[PDB]
Amino acid sequence: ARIAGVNIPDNKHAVISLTYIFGVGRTTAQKILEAVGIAPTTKVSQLDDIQLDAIRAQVANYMTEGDLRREVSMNIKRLVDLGCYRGIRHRRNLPVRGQNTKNNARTRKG
Amino acid sequence: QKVHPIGIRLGVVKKHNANWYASPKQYSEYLINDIQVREYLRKKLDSAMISNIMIERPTGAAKITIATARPGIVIGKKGEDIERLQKELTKMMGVPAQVNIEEITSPDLDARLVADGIGSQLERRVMFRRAMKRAVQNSMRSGAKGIKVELSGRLGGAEIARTEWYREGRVPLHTLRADIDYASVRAETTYGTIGVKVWIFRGE
Amino acid sequence: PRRRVVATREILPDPKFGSQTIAKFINHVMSHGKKSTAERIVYGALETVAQKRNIEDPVAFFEDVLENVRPMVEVKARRVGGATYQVPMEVRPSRRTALAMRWLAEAAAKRSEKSMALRLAGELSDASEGKGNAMKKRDEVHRMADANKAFS
């Protein structure tokens, strides 16, 4: 089945497949499936197309993956062009969250 | 490198100097008051030869017990000196406190007294070897089972500090029931500070 | 430890089969103190093999397979005249059993099957029919002694 512009593998449960979609998580998928008749146990292949359409409408209510990616990029760019200490941190590839970086500083550069 | 004999001996064969019960919050202030009283009393009575002091504070009034080789001067003439020390001790503390003095049968046996004598000897420049030998001999004449004296520092004004110890008698440190008496004093010699350690073993 | 020999601790025999060797085998499979997991894995593997072979006594089948697995002779290193060479010596009776149990556990670790019980059952079957990595390991241990067999 295709949700939100990308493909989800059909071999496992609906909630687990929704987890794969960017911007979608397991708890959010459970919340989505609770409202509508679809149950988390049922597989995507088993699940009917009309159910999938209602699911797409529920996902559409939530902010989509492209929109989320663009907002994150926009926020980082806003910090950079503001030039705040946080923007300087983003530009210089150093932890902006305040985490201690004396020795294990590896996981910012890549 | 050597544990304080008295601390280990407290458990079984010795009685704690301070014996008072207080609640957690009360305990913090009670201990500090006790330490202040001990320091002030030591400074006031430094000239006199005094043994270890046993202080018991009940609620309100505190009670103090002092054992000294020389009772007469500390009492004064008809208790005048003790009454003045008591008024000052009342001022520093709270509810009026009572202090009593117990005579010591023998000053040599008590560890503190001999160390005070040795400290005064070092202050007056009497030779350290003479001081240790005479101090040790007096105990053997008195009848103390064992006495050991150790001196650390720049003895005789030597550039290099050296440690000299003298034993005469069995002085088993590791026997917890040996009820060994230990006191430590410091002699303020002009060239440098001298540390005096005295061990007295009266028995079981 | 250059000290007196002391009596070994008495092992607790397993409940289901009431056999010393079975619990001794469960001990090696146990990891991080998970004796409950080891019991279940061992029971599952033994049940699988017993069902496959239609044998009433899995404990007897296990005794036969373990006896076959155990190596008689193990090479031991010795130092003479500042030189190191292999020396074949007869293995101690208990050591034979311990070695066989350890080798079976090690091979069951690397067997393909997804679950530990199936890996273990497959290894027991291969050991019983004289195939697989455990039998190869025992053959290698025997082979090292056979190669030279010039000492003791």
Added chain:
Amino acid sequence: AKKSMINRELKREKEVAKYADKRTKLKETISDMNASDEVRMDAMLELQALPRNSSPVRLRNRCAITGRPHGYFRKFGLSRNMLRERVMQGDVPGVRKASW
């Protein structure tokens, strides 16, 4: 420790003692669910307007004798070092060596 630091700690605890009750009443006022929003906000402004040292947070309890910041024990009120000396001398009641 330095006499300057000891006297600083004394004078710092002095305002805490002086404003102990005002802080209690003011904290109750701000936490009162019934109190008006503007009333609670004005009380909060007053609290932030209170002198620097008045808070019991700038207080750092220290050894009575040596004034050591560290190795402090609330039960005894002493640093680790002077506590060891007094305990081994036996001046600390009940306290003995531990081995269990």
Added chain:
Amino acid sequence: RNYGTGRRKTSTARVFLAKGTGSIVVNGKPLDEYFSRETSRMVVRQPLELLDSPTAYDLYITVKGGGISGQAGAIRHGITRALIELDDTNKPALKAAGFVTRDSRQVERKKLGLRKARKRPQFSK
């Protein structure tokens, strides 16, 4: 109405022995329900099987404290205690097994400077 006390490395258990059907109740509940481990069930029934008296006498068991596999051993030791109090003759054979020996192993002190009772910080050159 013989009674005895047996402990295993933490727990205490009290055992009551009398003639009867032989049903066993642990802490006011069935033994099989109470214990989820076959090994512990086997520890509980270890002594009676030895001299083939599983159902001869009724058993009443209450065991507080300790843990799942220590309570079973405590129950075993209590059963042996009551059996030995009942009968002198059994004691020698039960001793030959050793079930009448109270376990002296308990979780030991953590020595300061050591992560565990004996584990020490490794040093690498």
Added chain:
Amino acid sequence: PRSLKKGPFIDAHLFAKVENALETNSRKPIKTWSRRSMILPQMVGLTLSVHNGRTHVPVIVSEQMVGHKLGEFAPTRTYR
């Protein structure tokens, strides 16, 4: 960051300076030592001079700065 019920933290002396500057719309920098004060919508547009530890650096309060503390726009450590 800060409990919403307590509201923003705004120091009294910078508060006074900024209101007395708002009634004039003056452009001269407001030199200030408190870098812990909340930037409010009221002080959007004018210029402060926030202490960075060594000297004061100007900070022209832009629109996208409310919701940040004053010290965020005054780096303290200078690493090349």
Added chain:
Amino acid sequence: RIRIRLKSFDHRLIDQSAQEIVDTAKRTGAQVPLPTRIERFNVLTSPHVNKDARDQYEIRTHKRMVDIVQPTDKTVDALMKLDLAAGVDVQIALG
């Protein structure tokens, strides 16, 4: 039905105090151990370095509680006259 709770640091001392209190009520004819808190304190023997060298000190507080069936007129007052200070604390519920 007055109730007396005694707390002392010294285990040897607390027992003697309790025995005396029981003895007086027995003499006058009236008819008459909770967990002890244990705390451990860690002190570095070495001032500067060597954290693995340490002294650990434990203090125990012992509490004893007694119940009196019948507070007769003669019995009640002897409790107030008896005194034992310096390390023993007496608390009376009087309820």
Added chain:
RNA sequence: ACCAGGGAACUCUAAGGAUACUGCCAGUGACAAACUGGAGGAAGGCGGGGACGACGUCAAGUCAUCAUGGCCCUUACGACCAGGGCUACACACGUGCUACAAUGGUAGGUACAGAGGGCAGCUACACAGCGAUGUGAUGCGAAUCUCAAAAAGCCUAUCGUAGUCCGGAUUGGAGUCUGCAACUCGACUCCAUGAAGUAGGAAUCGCUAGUAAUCGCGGAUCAGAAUGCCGCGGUGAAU
């Protein structure tokens, strides 16, 4: 506290004694000290653990706990206060923590402790909240009330060898608390994002029994700030 049948028998709690001493049997032994096995006992040879560190060796560590000789500074090397810093990383380094998964992950149920802390206070219960926590309300200076629910474990559903329903680093967003203040620089809460890592080079370290490994729970400093340190008990090996 404990109830075996309202009782005091048992458990437990805490102050005392009793036992263990190669005592006993058999041996080997310079007719010896000793050792080897055996009975009994809960325990056998030091029953297990801890405390106790001899003369001295390293001019080993501490003038920054404190003390003291000498030496130096006295509108300054003394005294106060705001801000920041001790928290900065191209890289090296020793201690640990969490993983790389099926001896498992996640969902439901369901048991079994220990010791420790609580007015510079822990909160039973009601309601708001997905949550941390909020407003009420109540017991307790505690063998009473309380943190507190123990986790590994046992029963079922599923994932099916996949960088995964592994892993939770990192960042964006929203928030609750302590505190006068959380930007440099607090720990937690939910949502989303989901990096390396699929077992490790030469080399290297700890551990002999309730010990290694594993599991969580406490306390200290503490206004708030643990994987550290100091303790605890569950499971429980091989050699």
